[PDB]
Design a protein around this ligand. Structure first.
Ligand code: NAG
Length: 343
């Protein structure tokens, strides 16, 4: 049994989905503690699954099996980083995440692990604080990293102190959900999605500098994919594109199913379909507009995306992209009136 990059266990749900905890009471611990290893795939999956379960009631009517829940995004991406080897140690110094080592271990040295840790762990703490899990008197005890002055926080208090804006933005999301029963209002899906994206973006922006050195652990082609993806995510987030089950699977199905290497040039990678080859070009297209504009294009894009009509039009573009339609990022952005750069 191994994780499939886009199908997870087989039907889109993550590898080992059934094995992960639905509630805090199913986790290991003591009378006064709950134990979680943030460097273990199953415990990270439990950080997502417990929040999915605890927020199911807000999304239940919209679709079966909690599939309308917008928390699926980073849950599905956890499966993908495992399945494609991107959570393993890339340095060769340890066997963490390798088949001949502990395949569930998530390496400190992994760039993907580095950027994705907080959207699991800090978000989990924020959900706890907001009351998503009910009243919890037990202390969360996280496994500590080995590296001194690590980018990985290992307690509720340390995470708050090191990444205050990330804690605050995820808290805003969960507090909004918690407010709905007092009012008796049904969820405003566009608002909920905006709040969650704001937290994800804040996390990415708070991690980019501290995770940057890990990019040097990968060859230049894989390294550039990593950069391309993080910048592109900032543009996608501003469109308010949905992060529910079906849309998340649609995205990961277009991502490369293996690490890239020297020799790979999109859109001519012969062991990948046209949709994967096309998304690789598009991600680099966003990187290029961003780099050549000194980052100014993102500021203009965000201003434009203050309009709900603009956001809907931009989501239409994203859907074309996900279907494998070969659109030129630079050309499409200009159409939307973004001042675009020359070299
Ligand atoms: C939920 O998903 C499971 C697994 O894919 C499926 O067998 C089942 O039909 C779905 N449940 C409902 C109520 O639609």
């Amino acid at each position: 049994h191994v994780a499939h990059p886009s199908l997870g266990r087989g039907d889109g749900f993550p590898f080992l989905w059934d094995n992960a905890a639905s509630t805090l009471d199913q986790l290991n611990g003591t009378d006064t503690t709950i134990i979680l290893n943030g460097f273990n795939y199953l415990d990270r999956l439990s950080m997502f699954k417990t929040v999915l379960e605890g927020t199911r009631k807000y999304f239940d009517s919209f679709a079966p099996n909690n599939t309308a829940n917008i928390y699926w995004g980073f849950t599905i991406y956890l499966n993908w980083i495992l399945a494609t080897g991107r959570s393993a140690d890339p340095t060769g110094h340890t066997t963490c995440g390798l088949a001949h080592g502990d395949p569930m271990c998530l390496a400190e040295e992994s760039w993907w692990n580095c950027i994705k840790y907080n959207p699991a762990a800090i978000a989990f703490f924020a959900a706890k604080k907001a009351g998503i899990f009910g009243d919890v008197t037990k202390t969360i005890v996280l496994a500590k990293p080995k590296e001194a002055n690590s980018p990985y926080c290992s307690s509720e208090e340390e995470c708050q102190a090191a990444y205050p804006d990330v804690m605050a933005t995820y808290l805003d999301y969960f507090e909004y959900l918690m407010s709905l029963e007092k009012t008796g209002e049904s969820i405003d899906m566009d608002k909920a999605q905006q709040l969650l994206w704001k937290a994800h973006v804040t996390s990415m922006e708070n991690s980019i500098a501290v995770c940057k050195p890990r990019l040097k652990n990968y060859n230049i082609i894989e390294r550039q994919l990593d950069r391309d993806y993080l910048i592109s995510l900032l543009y996608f987030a501003a469109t308010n594109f949905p992060t529910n089950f079906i849309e998340s699977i649609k995205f990961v199905a277009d991502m490369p199913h293996r690490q890239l290497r020297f020799g790979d040039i999109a859109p001519f990678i012969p062991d990948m379909d046209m949709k994967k080859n096309n998304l690789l070009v598009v991600l680099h297209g966003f990187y290029t507009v961003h780099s050549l504009s000194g980052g100014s294009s993102l500021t203009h894009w965000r201003n434009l995306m203050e309009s709900p009509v603009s956001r809907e039009m931009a989501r239409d573009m994203v859907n074309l992209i996900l279907a494998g339609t070969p659109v030129e990022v630079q050309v499409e952005l200009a159409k939307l009136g973004i001042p675009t750069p020359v070299d």
